Write a protein that holds these residues in place. Sequence first.
Motif, PDB file in Angstrom:
ATOM      1  N   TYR A  75       0.818  -1.206   0.000  1.00 15.40           N
ATOM      2  CA  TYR A  75       0.000   0.000   0.000  1.00 15.40           C
ATOM      3  C   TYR A  75       0.856   1.262   0.000  1.00 15.40           C
ATOM      4  O   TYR A  75       0.295   2.362   0.015  1.00 15.40           O
ATOM      5  CB  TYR A  75      -0.927  -0.006   1.221  1.00 15.40           C
ATOM      6  N   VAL A  76       2.180   1.100   0.078  1.00 16.57           N
ATOM      7  CA  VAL A  76       3.095   2.274  -0.025  1.00 16.57           C
ATOM      8  C   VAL A  76       3.451   2.386  -1.501  1.00 16.57           C
ATOM      9  O   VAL A  76       3.365   3.492  -2.058  1.00 16.57           O
ATOM     10  CB  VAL A  76       4.335   2.094   0.865  1.00 16.57           C
ATOM     11  N   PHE A  77       3.746   1.248  -2.122  1.00 13.74           N
ATOM     12  CA  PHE A  77       4.147   1.227  -3.546  1.00 13.74           C
ATOM     13  C   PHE A  77       2.915   1.306  -4.441  1.00 13.74           C
ATOM     14  O   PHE A  77       2.957   2.099  -5.368  1.00 13.74           O
ATOM     15  CB  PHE A  77       4.982  -0.023  -3.808  1.00 13.74           C
ATOM     16  N   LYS A  78       1.854   0.554  -4.154  1.00 12.01           N
ATOM     17  CA  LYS A  78       0.625   0.708  -4.973  1.00 12.01           C
ATOM     18  C   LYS A  78       0.191   2.168  -4.944  1.00 12.01           C
ATOM     19  O   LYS A  78      -0.004   2.713  -6.023  1.00 12.01           O
ATOM     20  CB  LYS A  78      -0.540  -0.155  -4.495  1.00 12.01           C
ATOM     21  N   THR A  79       0.054   2.776  -3.764  1.00  6.59           N
ATOM     22  CA  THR A  79      -0.469   4.167  -3.753  1.00  6.59           C
ATOM     23  C   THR A  79       0.438   5.082  -4.573  1.00  6.59           C
ATOM     24  O   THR A  79      -0.103   5.845  -5.378  1.00  6.59           O
ATOM     25  CB  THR A  79      -0.670   4.719  -2.342  1.00  6.59           C
ATOM     26  N   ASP A  80       1.758   5.002  -4.388  1.00  7.78           N
ATOM     27  CA  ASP A  80       2.680   5.826  -5.211  1.00  7.78           C
ATOM     28  C   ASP A  80       2.500   5.487  -6.684  1.00  7.78           C
ATOM     29  O   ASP A  80       2.266   6.410  -7.462  1.00  7.78           O
ATOM     30  CB  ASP A  80       4.146   5.605  -4.862  1.00  7.78           C
ATOM     31  N   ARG A  81       2.617   4.215  -7.048  1.00 10.04           N
ATOM     32  CA  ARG A  81       2.556   3.839  -8.480  1.00 10.04           C
ATOM     33  C   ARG A  81       1.224   4.304  -9.058  1.00 10.04           C
ATOM     34  O   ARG A  81       1.217   4.749 -10.212  1.00 10.04           O
ATOM     35  CB  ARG A  81       2.795   2.341  -8.661  1.00 10.04           C
TER      36      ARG A  81
HETATM   37  C1  LIG Z   1      14.329   4.974   6.891  1.00  9.17           C
HETATM   38  C2  LIG Z   1      14.361   6.261   6.097  1.00  9.17           C
HETATM   39  C3  LIG Z   1      12.955   6.801   5.879  1.00  9.17           C
HETATM   40  C4  LIG Z   1      12.978   8.062   5.025  1.00  9.17           C
HETATM   41  C5  LIG Z   1      11.560   8.549   4.771  1.00  9.17           C
HETATM   42  C6  LIG Z   1      11.528   9.725   3.804  1.00  9.17           C
HETATM   43  C7  LIG Z   1      10.080  10.123   3.557  1.00  9.17           C
HETATM   44  C8  LIG Z   1       9.954  11.304   2.605  1.00  9.17           C
HETATM   45  C9  LIG Z   1       8.482  11.672   2.490  1.00  9.17           C
HETATM   46  C10 LIG Z   1       7.681  10.443   2.084  1.00  9.17           C
HETATM   47  C11 LIG Z   1       6.221  10.569   2.492  1.00  9.17           C
HETATM   48  C12 LIG Z   1       5.586  11.809   1.881  1.00  9.17           C
HETATM   49  C13 LIG Z   1       5.638  11.782   0.361  1.00  9.17           C
HETATM   50  C14 LIG Z   1       4.972  13.036  -0.184  1.00  9.17           C
HETATM   51  C15 LIG Z   1       4.865  12.992  -1.701  1.00  9.17           C
HETATM   52  C16 LIG Z   1       3.853  14.026  -2.180  1.00  9.17           C
HETATM   53  C17 LIG Z   1       2.542  13.922  -1.412  1.00  9.17           C
HETATM   54  C18 LIG Z   1       1.863  12.616  -1.742  1.00  9.17           C
HETATM   55  O1  LIG Z   1       0.787  12.610  -2.311  1.00  9.17           O
HETATM   56  O2  LIG Z   1       2.475  11.348  -1.385  1.00  9.17           O
HETATM   57  C19 LIG Z   1       2.628  10.343  -2.380  1.00  9.17           C
HETATM   58  C20 LIG Z   1       1.956   9.054  -1.933  1.00  9.17           C
HETATM   59  C21 LIG Z   1       0.648   9.382  -1.224  1.00  9.17           C
HETATM   60  O3  LIG Z   1       0.949   9.790   0.109  1.00  9.17           O
HETATM   61  P1  LIG Z   1      -0.113  10.613   0.991  1.00  9.17           P
HETATM   62  O4  LIG Z   1      -0.280  11.984   0.383  1.00  9.17           O
HETATM   63  O5  LIG Z   1       0.276  10.468   2.442  1.00  9.17           O
HETATM   64  O6  LIG Z   1      -1.475   9.794   0.753  1.00  9.17           O
HETATM   65  C22 LIG Z   1      -1.813   8.689   1.586  1.00  9.17           C
HETATM   66  C23 LIG Z   1      -3.270   8.322   1.337  1.00  9.17           C
HETATM   67  N1  LIG Z   1      -3.692   7.239   2.264  1.00  9.17           N
HETATM   68  O7  LIG Z   1       2.792   8.348  -1.023  1.00  9.17           O
HETATM   69  C24 LIG Z   1       2.309   6.992  -0.846  1.00  9.17           C
HETATM   70  O8  LIG Z   1       2.405   6.217  -1.781  1.00  9.17           O
HETATM   71  C25 LIG Z   1       1.661   6.558   0.447  1.00  9.17           C
HETATM   72  C26 LIG Z   1       2.680   6.444   1.573  1.00  9.17           C
HETATM   73  C27 LIG Z   1       3.340   7.778   1.890  1.00  9.17           C
HETATM   74  C28 LIG Z   1       4.183   7.648   3.151  1.00  9.17           C
HETATM   75  C29 LIG Z   1       5.107   6.442   3.058  1.00  9.17           C
HETATM   76  C30 LIG Z   1       5.985   6.328   4.295  1.00  9.17           C
HETATM   77  C31 LIG Z   1       7.138   5.363   4.062  1.00  9.17           C
HETATM   78  C32 LIG Z   1       7.765   4.973   5.393  1.00  9.17           C
HETATM   79  C33 LIG Z   1       9.108   4.287   5.195  1.00  9.17           C
HETATM   80  C34 LIG Z   1       9.599   3.673   6.499  1.00  9.17           C
HETATM   81  C35 LIG Z   1      11.048   3.229   6.364  1.00  9.17           C
HETATM   82  C36 LIG Z   1      11.469   2.300   7.495  1.00  9.17           C
HETATM   83  C37 LIG Z   1      10.703   0.986   7.427  1.00  9.17           C
HETATM   84  C38 LIG Z   1      11.248  -0.002   8.449  1.00  9.17           C
HETATM   85  C39 LIG Z   1      12.733  -0.246   8.216  1.00  9.17           C
HETATM   86  C40 LIG Z   1      13.334  -1.127   9.304  1.00  9.17           C
HETATM   87  C41 LIG Z   1      12.643  -2.470   9.364  1.00  9.17           C
END
Ligand SMILES: CCCCCCCCCCCCCCCCCC(=O)OC[C@H](COP(=O)(O)OCCN)OC(=O)CCCCCCCCCCCCCCCCC
Lengths: 95, 178, 73, 276, 123, 55, 89, 124, 126, 65, 459
Positions: free
Chosen positions: I100-106
């Motif tokens: 749901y992180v990659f599907k939503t982005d893609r």
């Molecule tokens: C470890 C280093 C981590 C570095 C993190 C850096 C993050 C930078 C910002 C990323 C999140 C904001 C991106 C903003 C892009 C423009 C706005 C946008 O529309 O997002 C794109 C898309 C949709 O996101 P959103 O607007 O939140 O909509 C969610 C609706 N339910 O986005 C999506 O597809 C939905 C998901 C957005 C948020 C994803 C969060 C990812 C978390 C990564 C965790 C990493 C660690 C995992 C565990 C590692 C150890 C085991």
Amino acid sequence: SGYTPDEKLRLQQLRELRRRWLKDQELSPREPVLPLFAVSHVLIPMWFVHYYVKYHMATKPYTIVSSKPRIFPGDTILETGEVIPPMRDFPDQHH
Amino acid sequence: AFCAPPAYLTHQQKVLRLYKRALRHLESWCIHRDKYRYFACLMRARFEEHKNEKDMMRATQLLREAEEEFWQNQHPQPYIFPDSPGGTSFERYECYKVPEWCLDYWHPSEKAMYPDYFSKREQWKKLRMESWDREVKQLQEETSPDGIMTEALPPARREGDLPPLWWHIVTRPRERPT
Amino acid sequence: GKMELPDYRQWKIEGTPLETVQKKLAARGLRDPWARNEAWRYMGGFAGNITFPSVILKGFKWGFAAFVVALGA
Amino acid sequence: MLCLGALTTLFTAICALTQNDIKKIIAFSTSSQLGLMMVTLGMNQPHLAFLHICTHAFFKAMLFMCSGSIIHSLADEQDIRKMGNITKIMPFTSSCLVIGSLALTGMPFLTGFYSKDLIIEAINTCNTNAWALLITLIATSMTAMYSMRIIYFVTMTKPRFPPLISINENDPDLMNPIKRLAFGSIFAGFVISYNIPPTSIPVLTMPWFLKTTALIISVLGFLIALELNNLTMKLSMNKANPYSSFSTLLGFFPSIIHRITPMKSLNLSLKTSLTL
Amino acid sequence: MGAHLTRRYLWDASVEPDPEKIPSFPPDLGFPERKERVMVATQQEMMDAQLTLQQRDYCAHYLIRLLKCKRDSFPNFLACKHEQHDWDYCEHLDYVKRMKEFERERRLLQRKKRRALKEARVA
Amino acid sequence: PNINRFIKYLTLFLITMLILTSANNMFQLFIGWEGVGIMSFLLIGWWYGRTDANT
Amino acid sequence: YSDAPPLTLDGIKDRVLYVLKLYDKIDPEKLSVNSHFMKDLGLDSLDQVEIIMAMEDEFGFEIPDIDAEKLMCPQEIVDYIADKKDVYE
Amino acid sequence: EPYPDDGMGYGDYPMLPNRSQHERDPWYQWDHSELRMNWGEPIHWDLDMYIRNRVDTSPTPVSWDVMCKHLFGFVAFMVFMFWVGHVFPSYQPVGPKQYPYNNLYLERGGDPTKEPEPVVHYDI
Amino acid sequence: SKYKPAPLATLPSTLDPAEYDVSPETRRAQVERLSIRARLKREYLLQYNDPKRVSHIEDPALIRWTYARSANIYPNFRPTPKNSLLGAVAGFGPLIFWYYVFKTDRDRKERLIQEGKLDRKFNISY
Amino acid sequence: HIQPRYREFPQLTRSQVIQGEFLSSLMWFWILWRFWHDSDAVLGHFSYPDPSQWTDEELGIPPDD
Amino acid sequence: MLKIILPSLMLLPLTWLSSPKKTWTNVTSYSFLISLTSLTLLWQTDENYKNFSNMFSSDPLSTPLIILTAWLLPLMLMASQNHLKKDNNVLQKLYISMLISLQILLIMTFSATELIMFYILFEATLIPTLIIITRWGNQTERLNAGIYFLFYTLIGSIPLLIALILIQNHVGTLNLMILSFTTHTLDASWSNNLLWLACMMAFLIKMPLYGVHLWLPKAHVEAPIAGSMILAAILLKLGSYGMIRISIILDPLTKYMAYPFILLSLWGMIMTSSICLRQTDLKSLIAYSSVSHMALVIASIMIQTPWSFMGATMLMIAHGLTSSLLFCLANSNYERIHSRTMIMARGLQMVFPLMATWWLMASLANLALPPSINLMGELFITMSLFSWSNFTIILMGINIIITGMYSMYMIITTQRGKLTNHMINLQPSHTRELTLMALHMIPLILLTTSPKLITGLTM
Ligand SMILES: CCCCCCCCCCCCCCCCCC(=O)OC[C@H](COP(=O)(O)OCCN)OC(=O)CCCCCCCCCCCCCCCCC
């Protein structure tokens, strides 16, 4: 405390042996029995480089590109012959 | 590092080993010397008193409040010598302390040079094999009746016998190989 | 060459900052036993107090002497 | 980066004040100066940031090799605690050390001065975080303080090194390079600043306290520290402040973030991802 | 650092200017036919002297001079000293302007506060 | 005992450092960025025996 | 050169002797190698700690606790220091 | 003391104190010197993590909580103060810099054909 | 302030009550344990210092460790709760999170490309 | 051959002292020479204007009303 | 391509007919030259793939491998001359022949036009491998490992058999050339969504995916060095080669039927990389390193962007050479140490100075140091993955940090630290051991000079 009379002899004796080991480690005479240049590596490398830079790079396109030379007001352009116009006079003399 | 660890610690060695950590952790606070030598003969006073307490309970109640006074009045960067565990040169030269059983796989060419060296090395290896029997037997004949057993090993106790389990306290790679 | 060592007697606490520490310790009644060992620190050669301006200003005397001359020429 | 450069400048400088290892103090100073370099890049002044990189290289290189000389000449003692009065025992390195120390503290007309005060007054004149502006300036006073800490403990104090003394710095291989860099440390800022291309359009117009702030803060930084070094010599116990240990063990970032992360990152592999 | 900030941050900012909008009032306000700035250098002269965009100030003209005397006089990097004073001056004489403009905007804003109250005649 | 290897790595460090300095495409900048990292690893822990240097 | 001359036992021997001759409690004209601290010279359980510490600061290394609860004779100190520093004379 | 029987595999492996090899007496002649472990002594389950080149559990002069709070307090205060800063910045009494032409419209790469709304700057 | 051992930064030897104990039973263990170690020590020290030996000293205490850690695990596995709930959150938890992180982005990307907003400028590669 | 000294001030070689005074003295000659030739460490050479002395005519402050 | 193959077959007669004492040199010397004939295929002075004949073809993707498959037989036979030198003179000639048949079969599989020729030869390679692992495997558990290696591949294999016979009926020929120039567009039904899984799953199994990779750690652990080299260098890559040629058909479904695997692989890359961080058996750690660095490949052969594909081709050839190098040096420590444990044997550089240089270069190849094809490969897969979704860098970003940590830990706890006190004294290094390594890395240095040759079909 104080060393035990039977540990001041196991250190007495083993130290005596360590002293002999280190003496034996000492090498006897003969022990090892085996059986301007500056220009050299500055000039010789250079000729080659030049050979490479003036006859490959220079020859190939866009291999050595340089910022344009700076041309100021009143200084002549050698290649074309033009003389850069002198600039508008600086009116102020205020220091 | 040489002598073996005692099983339990006495009262004394615990007190007398604080006198070291304490005084040595007072020379990190007192960077100068005259200040130190002063602030330290005042330390002994603290240990000097309460020296003749006969009431063990008390003594172990002065010790347990000394080592907590100390833990909270210690220096974070104590002055630990250059070559001691925790130091700055600890185990630095160990990259050059090869273990000496490696000169046995040298090519006959290499050992050709350095000739007298191996003539004396072959003597010592004769010493080692010539006594393993008398040694292990000693180690065993003198196994005190089964009971407490400490890591202390016996001395020689007879002429010609080489104080035992000695091949690695002697023949130790030299400290500074350099 | 069988390095010799200065006579142990040479060292004495008077004349050095250890002496003032010695006297206040004596006021408490403590004897300051190892003070003599810590004497060569203050004993000689290293006896002179070093002042912070002295280090920052090391060589300033000739430096200015050099400056004046150059300024002249 | 203006913000994080600023935090590292003081964070690293405050840690350096109580560190008792000579090499460690110089290294923290390496980080603090680069923190200032990060600050100028953060204030979008790229050319001057590069100018400090070059001047930073000459003096920091000197101080390290200066301590290289002290550590090797002494029996590998790397602690300011046991090293003292190098000024009389070894004037050649002590002279090089103070030349480097003053360059680090931006002494007027030395290589640090040509580039460093340009950066300082740049801050005092731009629009910037108030917290960043205040920390960078006290970071400059601390640079003088720890600089003072090194020369007082390492050079101007009664000797405290082990009793046998065997010091030789005569070897050409020691002096020559130290001598050559010293010439660079003395003249490089003069040469580089005039020769480089005019760049950045600096603001030389300032109220005089901002124009001279770098000079004064550096001066009182040493002044206050000298008061501190002097204080210790007394027969009275000061020890250190509660936040002093916080300073001495590097702000506790090493004690906590180095024991938790490597522990909760490996526990999860063996216990959870690998075996479970 | 300074008092000006204290005025704006401490106390009240009503009459303290906002750095983001310095010419906040009418440009002509206060001046009949105020003369605009003038640039000696030529949009090309600069482009041929490869002056960094930022360095293309109203002092670009004294700069080009410095740079001229720095390429010429090459082996001697210590002799184009008068040229640097000039450039700097030009710029000091520009920083001052940028200060005069800021002070003028300050005062004018005050005029508003004064006038409002004055113009805010009770009745 | 190994002076020559130590000098060897110092110049290799300089070669990577200068490549990092004068790098037009960033792939070469990467070669320098990673390159000084690895030789720093080799040179911080010169005395491999000491675990402190390895850590 | 930079590294000092290697210790020769007969030196280390004199150095340990010397420092003690500077400890006020230990007579300077009796300190004799093989003169145990707590049995002959009269020092107390707490002095030894210091006598050792002086030596640790004269020779620049740490005599571990367990190996130093026994530096009694004023000689054990002279071979232990040397053995720890590899002096085969 | 067998590891708790919750069926995660430990089995009969002893649950040895979770203390790192860092505080094992650094002077004793440990058979395996670098693991500071003797020959035969039960190895700890996670000795791949307590090794010296890895995690440590060595008492610290300052209590751990005190550490975590202090460090993060510092971090927070700083971050916050930096915010107080952005709210109240430091800026000299200087008006905006004035660039010639139309704020260098063409040279900032502006379109040659479309002239920009003239931005003029006047004296004083 | 009293030092406060945490699972890390543990209670030092000193400051530890147990250290300050002479109850003859405790001393009994403390002297019994040296024996086990002394015994094991005198079983390493005359087998490693043995001339005439080429075979590999084994250190069976390390062989009991590896077997316990990679070949005595599944024979001691009993599926409980706190083990299967935690054995599914670990395998499918993030694996469903990122979907749901990659599907939503893609999907966001695709929509934008479809509607004509994504610039994809100077991108001539992929 | 430098001789290790015990509890004495290490003897110093001619060169050690002269080179040390040399580097330091040049540092001071340079600081003094530049200070004389270029004393713009203080004041730069451009004076800050007093922003509070600008006649209201200077800034375009209209006559109130 | 029957010179890379017929002369190979003839190796078998030579291993048997030749003298017991001279059997080793005849075989190793001749296959070195067999590799030299293999180099002729690299002469492509035009884009058109080289269809040697009806059944045998070599295109940019196969050519970089056929040469590697021919190259390792010499090396495999040089790394197993020690163990297998204690045999009866007829067990050797069997092992040598087994190794010979692997590349004969593997050369053909990588150089096969008909996809089912791939299947028959593809699944045949298990026979030679299972014999190498089970018959000569040192540990008690190789019978088990062999079972795991046969069943995981076999259960995947029969679905592919049904799928390929299925497409032949649907299209009318399994000839990779035609299948490419013909319209085979699946229709996103529920059934097709199964076909796609049938074709890819068999390839995904031998290319360890996170879900089914347990076979590879178990297999390489007890496998002899030659078997472990073959499994890591050529055997696992058989799965990748298959995924590149089979997804020419099933073109529409992988757009949306790949998400499951892609996420399985990228999360798998992190966990497989991490467990390397605390694994006591060195051969175990290299094997999981192999799973993670191969999990990147299944995540580039599925994103399907030009760069992915050649990122994949670069990494597969590069990681193949690097992994063997690591498995080969692991064996040299294992034979003197006599134990696979990583904790024992500390400080070797002190006693084996050069092997440590080979260890260092192998580790730097293992992690992505930049003037190496290994990095170019990951840099490219990383780029495309980023294009698929900018978030991918986070997961492909935790792997890079972990990959650096385990690669250096192998060097730090095996080739540095204080020497082990007295394990059986470690005899010096043979020249064979060192060459077997040099032969792995000298090609890694040469290929990095001109990466174009191993760039794949896409570029
Ligand atoms: C470890 C280093 C981590 C570095 C993190 C850096 C993050 C930078 C910002 C990323 C999140 C904001 C991106 C903003 C892009 C423009 C706005 C946008 O529309 O997002 C794109 C898309 C949709 O996101 P959103 O607007 O939140 O909509 C969610 C609706 N339910 O986005 C999506 O597809 C939905 C998901 C957005 C948020 C994803 C969060 C990812 C978390 C990564 C965790 C990493 C660690 C995992 C565990 C590692 C150890 C085991």
